[PDB]
Structures are given as C-alpha cells and as structure tokens.
Amino acid sequence: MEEQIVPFYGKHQAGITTAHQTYVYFAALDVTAKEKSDIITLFRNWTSLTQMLTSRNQYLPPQDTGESADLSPSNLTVTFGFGPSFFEKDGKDRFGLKSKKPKHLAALPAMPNDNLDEKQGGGDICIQVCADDEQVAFHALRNLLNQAVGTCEVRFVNKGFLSGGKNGETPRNLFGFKDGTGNQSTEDDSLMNSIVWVQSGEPDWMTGGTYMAFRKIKMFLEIWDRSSLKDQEDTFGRRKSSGAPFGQKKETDPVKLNQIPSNSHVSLAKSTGKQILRRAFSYTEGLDPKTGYMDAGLLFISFQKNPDNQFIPMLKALSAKDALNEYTQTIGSALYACPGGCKKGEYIAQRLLES
Amino acid sequence: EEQIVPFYGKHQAGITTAHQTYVYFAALDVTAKEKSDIITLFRNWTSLTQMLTSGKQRNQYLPPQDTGESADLSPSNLTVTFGFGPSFFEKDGKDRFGLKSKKPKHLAALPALDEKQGGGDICIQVCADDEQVAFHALRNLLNQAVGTCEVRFVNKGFLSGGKNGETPRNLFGFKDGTGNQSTEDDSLMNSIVWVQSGEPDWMTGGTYMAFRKIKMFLEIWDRSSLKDQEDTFGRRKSSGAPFGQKKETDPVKLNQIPSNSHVSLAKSTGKQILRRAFSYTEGLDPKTGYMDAGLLFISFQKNPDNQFIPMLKALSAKDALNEYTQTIGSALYACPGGCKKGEYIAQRLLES
Numbered sequence: 194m195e196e197q198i199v200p201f202y203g204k205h206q207a208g209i210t211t212a213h214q215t216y217v218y219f220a221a222l223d224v225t226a227k228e229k230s231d232i233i234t235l236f237r238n239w240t241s242l243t244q245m246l247t248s249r250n251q252y253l254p255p256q257d258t259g260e261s262a263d264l265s266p267s268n269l270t271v272t273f274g275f276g277p278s279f280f281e282k283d284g285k286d287r288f289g290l291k292s293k294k295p296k297h298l299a300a301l302p303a304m305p306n307d308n309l310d311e312k313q314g315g316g317d318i319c320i321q322v323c324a325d326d327e328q329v330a331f332h333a334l335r336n337l338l339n340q341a342v343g344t345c346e347v348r349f350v351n352k353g354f355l356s357g358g359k360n361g362e363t364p365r366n367l368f369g370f371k372d373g374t375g376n377q378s379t380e381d382d383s384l385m386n387s388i389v390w391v392q393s394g395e396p397d398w399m400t401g402g403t404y405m406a407f408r409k410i411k412m413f414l415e416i417w418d419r420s421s422l423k424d425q426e427d428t429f430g431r432r433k434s435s436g437a438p439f440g441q442k443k444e445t446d447p448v449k450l451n452q453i454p455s456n457s458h459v460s461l462a463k464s465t466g467k468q469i470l471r472r473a474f475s476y477t478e479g480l481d482p483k484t485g486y487m488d489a490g491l492l493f494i495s496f497q498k499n500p501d502n503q504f505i506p507m508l509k510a511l512s513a514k515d516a517l518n519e520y521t522q523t524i525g526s527a528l529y530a531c532p533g534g535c536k537k538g539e540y541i542a543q544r545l546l547e548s
Numbered sequence: 549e550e551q552i553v554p555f556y557g558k559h560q561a562g563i564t565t566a567h568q569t570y571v572y573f574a575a576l577d578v579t580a581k582e583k584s585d586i587i588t589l590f591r592n593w594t595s596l597t598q599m600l601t602s603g604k605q606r607n608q609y610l611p612p613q614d615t616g617e618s619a620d621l622s623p624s625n626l627t628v629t630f631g632f633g634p635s636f637f638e639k640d641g642k643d644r645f646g647l648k649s650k651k652p653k654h655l656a657a658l659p660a661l662d663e664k665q666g667g668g669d670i671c672i673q674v675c676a677d678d679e680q681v682a683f684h685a686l687r688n689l690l691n692q693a694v695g696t697c698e699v700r701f702v703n704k705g706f707l708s709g710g711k712n713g714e715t716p717r718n719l720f721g722f723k724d725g726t727g728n729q730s731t732e733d734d735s736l737m738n739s740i741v742w743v744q745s746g747e748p749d750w751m752t753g754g755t756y757m758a759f760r761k762i763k764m765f766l767e768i769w770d771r772s773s774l775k776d777q778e779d780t781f782g783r784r785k786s787s788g789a790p791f792g793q794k795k796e797t798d799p800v801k802l803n804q805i806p807s808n809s810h811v812s813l814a815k816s817t818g819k820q821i822l823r824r825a826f827s828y829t830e831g832l833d834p835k836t837g838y839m840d841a842g843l844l845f846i847s848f849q850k851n852p853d854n855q856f857i858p859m860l861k862a863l864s865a866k867d868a869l870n871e872y873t874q875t876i877g878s879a880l881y882a883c884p885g886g887c888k889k890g891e892y893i894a895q896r897l898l899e900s
C-alpha cells in the first residue's frame with residue numbers, strides 16, 4: 194500500500210471532508226485552568242504533537258507511550274472544536290474571547306424525544322480522532338489527553354467503528370443499512386463550500402472552519418432485529434441490501450418522495466430542503482447495566498457551516514414524527530465550532546487565542 | 549476465500565489460530581431447564597458459526613434472518629470459540645442437565661473480583677480482523693440464544709500487530725507474546741494447550757480458557773520512568789529483549805532481571821501457557837476521571853491446576869506489575885474439542 198497519511202496543515206482541518214476512516218475516538222474536555230496562556234500552550238503543544246502523530250534519559254518517563262511504534266499512521270486525523278462553554282460559562286465570559294465568539298455556537302434546542310445525559314454532551318473542547326486502526330486512534334487520543342492533564346479534565350470519551358464495503362460500498366450502520374448515501378461528494382469543493390465550510394461572515398479563525406454537531410444515539414438492536422424487513426425498510430425509505438430508494442433500481446438514483454412513507458427517516462430529512470455532511474460511527478458499549486440489554490448505537494457526527502439553518506430544522510422535523518424514533522433514543526448532544534485549518538508554523542486556534 | 553479460518557476440525561478455531569485484531573468476549577447463563585433446549589442451541593450455533601466463518605429469497609414480511617451489517621465485508625479470519633464454566637454442570641448443588649458425571653477434572657473457579665464480570669455457564673470468544681465483523685458474529689449468535697440463555701456480560705478488545713510481523717504491543721507499549729511457543733509447532737501445542745488425557749472424552753482435543761479482566765493504570769504508567777517500566781517486566785521496551793541480551797527472541801537469563809519482575813516470576817514457575825490476550829478501553833474511570841483501559845487476558849492450557857494456578861500464585865504476591873494493574877474479573881472455561889462436519893459443538897458432552 195501507499196503511505197496512509199492525511200495532511201494535517203492546510204486551509205481546513207482534516208477529519209471533516211477527509212475520507213471516512215474505520216475507527217474513531219471522540220473526547221470532550223473542560224478547561225479548568227483560568228488563564229488563556231495555559232490554553233495557548235495547550236494548543237501549540239497539541240499542534241506539534243498532532244503534526245508528529247499524523248505524519249535518552251532512562252530515569253525519565255518515555256515521551257511517547259509506545260503502543261503504535263510498529264503501526265502505520267492509518268490515515269490518522271485529529272479534529273479540534275470549541276463548545277459554547279469555552280466562550281461563556283456560569284454567566285461569565287472566559288479568556289476574553291467575546292469579540293471572537295462564533296455566530297451559531299450555542300447548545301442545541303431541547304427536543305421532546307430527548308433523554309439527554311448532560312455528562313454525555315457539551316464540553317469546552319472536543320477532539321475527534323480517526324484512523325483505520327483502533328490502536329492507532331487510541332494511541333493518538335491518549336497522548337493528546339496526556340498533554341492536557343493540568344489544564345483540562347476529560348468530560349467523556351466515546352469510541353466507535355464503521356466498516357466500509359470490501360469493494361468500496363457505502364458503509365452500513367448497526368441496523369444493516371447503507372449509511373452516507375445522501376451526502377454530497379466530499380471531493381466536490383463547490384458542494385463542500387456550500388454545505389460545510391464557513392467562507393465569510395464569521396471571525397477569521399472560523400473561516401475555513403465548520404460547526405460539528407454531536408448526537409449519541411442509542412439503537413434498540415433487539416427489537417429492530419425482531420422487526421420485519423418491510424418495517425425496517427419502511428423506517429428509512431430505502432431497500433436494505435441495495436440501499437436504493439423505493440421505486441428505484443440503484444442506491445444513487447434520486448429519492449422519489451411520493452414513493453416512501455412521509456414519516457420515514459429519509460423523507461423527513463429530505464423534506465427540510467437542508468443539507469449537512471454526516472460522518473457518523475457506530476458504537477457498542479457492552480450491556481446496559483440497568484436493563485441488561487445491549488448498549489449500542491450511533492455516534493452521530495455531522496458538519497455544517499450554519500447549524501441554525503441546516504441542522505436544527507432537521508432535528509425539529511425528525512424529533513416530531515420520525516419512524517426511526519421507535520428504534521432510537523438520543524442520550525447525548527453537543528455543538529462545537531471547529532476552527533479553520535492550521536498553517537505550518539502556526540498553531541491550532543491561534544487566530545482565536547492570540548492577542 | 550483467503551481470510552477464512554476453518555470452523556470444523558480436530559480443535560476449535562481461535563486458540564492456536566493466528567491472533568486477530570479484534571475480539572468480542574461474551575458470557576451467557578443458561579435459563580432453559582430441559583437439556584433438549586441446550587442441544588438445539590448448540591446445533592443451531594454450529595450451523596450459524598459455520599455460515600458466519602465461511603463467508604456465505606426470504607419473505608420481506610418476516611424478520612431478516614441475518615442482521616445485515618457484515619454483508620459487504622470480508623470474513624476477516626473470523627473465529628468463534630465456545631467454552632463451559634463450572635456452573636454449566638452444577639449450580640447451587642443441583643446437577644442441572646445430568647452432566648455433572650461428565651464435568652471436566654480441573655474446572656473450578658480460580659482461587660482468590662467482580663462476579664458480574666466473570667463466571668457464566670457458556671463463554672463465546674469471537675475474533676476477527678475487523679471489529680464490525682466480530683460484533684456481527686456475536687450479535688447473530690446471541691440472537692439465536694434468546695429464550696434459552698441470558699447474556700451475562702460482553703467485553704470487547706483489540707490488539708494490532710506490527711505491519712512487519714512484529715510482536716504486538718499492549719497498552720503499556722511492550723511487546724506481548726514473546727514467551728509463547730510457536731502456535732505452528734504441533735508437538736508443543738499438544739504439550740501445552742491440547743487435552744488428550746485425563747478428562748471426559750468430549751474434552752479431548754479441547755483445552756481450558758482462563759479469562760482475566762485486568763485494569764491497567766495508564767495515567768500513572770505514562771508518568772513512570774522508562775527504567776521503572778522495564779524493571780517491571782525484565783525486558784527492554786523497544787527491542788523486547790531480556791535484560792543483558794540483544795534480541796527479543798534471545799533466551800531469558802533470570803540472573804539478569806529482577807526477581808520480582810513479571811517475566812521472572814512467571815517463567816520461574818517452570819510452567820507454560822498459551823496467551824492470546826487483547827487490549828481494551830471503556831471510557832473514563834469515574835473514581836479517578838482518567839481512562840478506563842486494560843487487558844482482556846485470555847490464556848489456554850491443558851491443565852490450569854498444573855500450568856496456570858502456579859503462575860497466579862507467584863504473581864499475586866510479588867509481581868511488580870501489580871503496582872500498575874488491578875484484576876477486575878476472572879473466569880475459567882472448559883473448551884470442547886473441535887467439531888467434525890456433520891456434528892455439533894459439544895455433541896459428545898450433550899448426547900451422552
């Protein structure tokens with residue numbers, strides 16, 4: 194194989210329109226330090242380390258933890274984002290960043306379907322670590338988090354997986370359906386600018402950036418597995434094996450809305466007329482300690498340049514009447530502003546944090 | 549089809565099979581009360597495992613027989629290994645299905661742990677080079693067992709070997725596996741792993757599986773000196789060589805390593821096992837707010853009383869590794885010998 198490296202420095206952060214890797218570690222952190230200088234050091238230390246990750250005194254602790262020494266970089270990417278709590282917490286503006294706060298960075302509105310665990314969402318800082326090998330992804334996250342002890346406390350850490358098809362087929366979620374068809378092509382720069390990338394109207398540090406929505410969505414695999422193929426397909430409006438819209442021959446044929454249930458998932462999301470870039474991963478977390486049922490679902494991640502215009506209307510349309518709600522439950526939620534890309538020589542979020 | 553491991557044979561796959569990258573490890577309790585339900589369970593598991601591992605119409609108004617998420621994936625060297633805990637033969641004094649007369653001779657819970665994190669009547673170890681493939685296999689196996697078993701726990705894990713065939717590294721960053729004999733050396737695996745005498749005949753060609761869920765304190769480990777890390781094991785970190793030797797594969801000179809090092813204590817027992825462990829991570833430790841991670845320690849041995857319990861004894865008292873680890877769960881399972889095509893897993897035990 195060729196080198197499995199994704200460029201870290203550029204106009205954009207990697208991990209967004211980068212091709213979807215197989216594994217993710219997703220962590221949220223809260224800043225406990227009270228001085229912006231500590232955060233500056235964090236982000237320049239994170240930048241140098243991430244550049245190393247993505248590319249003699251025995252009485253001292255090893256600088257690196259060592260468990261990816263013999264492994265390929267496996268298309269490792271690290272994406273950083275800022276939560277609303279980074280800018281304002283407990284009624285006070287932090288670190289003097291009011292002038293630089295993004296337009297659309299607020300917590301997502303409360304939906305009635307939600308069973309949100311506050312500790313499973315939010316966070317001042319998110320770190321999305323993706324690679325085609327789970328040990329590589331964990332190694333990257335662990336070394337990054339090792340730098341933040343002293344400055345931050347980790348809020349939560351999730352991990353997930355999503356295997357694309359052997360022949361390049363659209364990857365399937367835990368319900369067995371191709372997941373990602375409705376995305377536009379990430380190699381179409383024009384469409385990514387219109388959907389994902391902030392181009393103007395925001396602070397300089399957010400230009401070339403995007404907003405990341407995070408929803409941890411439990412999936413009721415047991416009752417889904419007892420449901421008929423027809424019910425499963427009716428839930429989505431696509432046929433399970435082909436991923437083709439109802440009444441169509443191929444996965445990539447256009448959805449015909451008059452042929453699918455109006456409460457189906459695809460119909461409702463298509464109804465808004467809005468677009469986002471989904472980049473989710475499945476998770477399994479053993480058995481629910483309470484119910485003794487399998488804990489599994491979707492780490493739903495999507496990017497959009499304007500979440501108020503593109504993402505909240507989807508939540509509203511789905512939270513109302515989505516057939517998928519029978520089989521899912523949102524238990525975690527967060528929104529993060531992902532900075533524009535980093536130039537070599539500079540550090541992540543330098544335009545935001547620097548005086 | 550290249551990434552296919554044979555399911556039928558003299559032995560169960562997943563033991564001397566080359567170590568795959570991902571594991572799901574489940575324990576089930578039998579809730580059915582009639583032995584005929586257990587036989588159909590194992591017959592159906594045998595057919596389904598044969599389908600799942602080999603790669604390989606129905607009406608849309610019925611539930612799909614398969615859950616679908618591995619449809620476009622390679623078999624990925626999927627193996628599925630079955631074992632029985634002591635409770636499968638007697639629980640609370642009762643002989644449950646007339647099987648106690650066929651109980652294995654060394655199947656007693658390991659002497660002193662979270663009990664919800666060990667035990668069980670049945671274990672299933674599912675290994676594949678792709679995590680989605682392994683979950684799909686376990687999920688469909690567990691779906692077949694509803695009504696007859698309840699799932700006790702599910703752990704999962706990972707262990708990536710080097711691209712250059714290098715020995716895989718655990719989460720402390722040390723090569724892990726060097727002390728194992730070659731799993732391709734049939735005579736050595738016969739001597740260490742495979743049962744051919746001293747057990748009921750369904751155990752012939754089988755083995756005992758030891759499972760230990762061992763928490764690894766990564767935060768304090770990563771803050772410990774490289775010399776302290778090496779002194780813990782008695783091998784150098786990058787090369788994996790025993791102290792005083794050049795190569796990973798050089799013999800261990802016990803005079804050159806601390807008497808309380810992990811390698812010294814285990815080797816000086818004179819005993820040997822076949823270790824086939826996987827790393828794990830499971831979110832944050834709430835008591836400390838640091839990463840909850842560890843080793844899913846899995847070993848195979850023909851006689852745990854002779855080969856494994858001596859190691860547990862020597863390490864539990866004096867191992868320097870105990871400073872950085874804590875055992876959270878423990879179980880011992882008896883794995884049946886292999887299944888011949890036409891038969892079913894544990895037929896010789898269940899048919900009587």
Ligand code: HEM
Nearest residue numbers: 366370371372373374375410429459462463491507508521
């Ligand atoms: C466990 C939760 C979810 C599952 C299993 C799921 C699965 C799917 C599937 C199978 C499709 C059809 C194939 C595709 O185009 O990818 C789809 C489409 C889509 N879903 Fe989801 N989804 C989930 C949650 C969400 C949420 C929370 C949102 C938005 C708030 C969302 C937005 C969309 C969009 C925008 C599409 C493409 C619609 C189009 O064709 O234009 N999904 N999803």
Ligand code: HEM
Nearest residue numbers: 718722723724725726727762781811814815843859860873
């Ligand atoms: C988190 C827990 C553990 C870790 C991190 C760990 C790691 C290691 C490492 C790095 C080595 C040296 C390289 C090798 O030969 O593989 C080793 C050797 C070994 N370990 Fe462990 N191990 C753990 C638990 C255990 C347990 C619980 C046992 C037995 C009850 C055990 C038995 C052995 C044996 C038999 C050897 C080979 C000794 C020889 O050279 O003859 N290990 N282990």
Ligand SMILES: [Cl-]
Nearest residue numbers: 199200201202
């Ligand atoms: Cl670069």
Ligand SMILES: [Cl-]
Nearest residue numbers: 349350831832
């Ligand atoms: Cl967590």
Ligand SMILES: [Cl-]
Nearest residue numbers: 210211379380
């Ligand atoms: Cl691209």
Ligand SMILES: [Cl-]
Nearest residue numbers: 391392393498
């Ligand atoms: Cl814009």
Ligand SMILES: [Cl-]
Nearest residue numbers: 478479830831
């Ligand atoms: Cl977990």
Ligand SMILES: [Cl-]
Nearest residue numbers: 477478479704
């Ligand atoms: Cl799991």
Ligand SMILES: [Cl-]
Nearest residue numbers: 296394498499
């Ligand atoms: Cl705007």
Ligand SMILES: [Cl-]
Nearest residue numbers: 765833836838
């Ligand atoms: Cl800890």
Ligand SMILES: [Cl-]
Nearest residue numbers: 798799800801
């Ligand atoms: Cl040796």
Ligand code: NA
Nearest residue numbers: 375446447448
């Ligand atoms: Na369409």
Ligand code: NA
Nearest residue numbers: 638639640641
């Ligand atoms: Na008993």
Ligand code: NA
Nearest residue numbers: 479480701702
């Ligand atoms: Na569990």
Ligand code: NA
Nearest residue numbers: 262263786787
């Ligand atoms: Na090395």
Ligand code: NA
Nearest residue numbers: 352829830831
């Ligand atoms: Na984890």
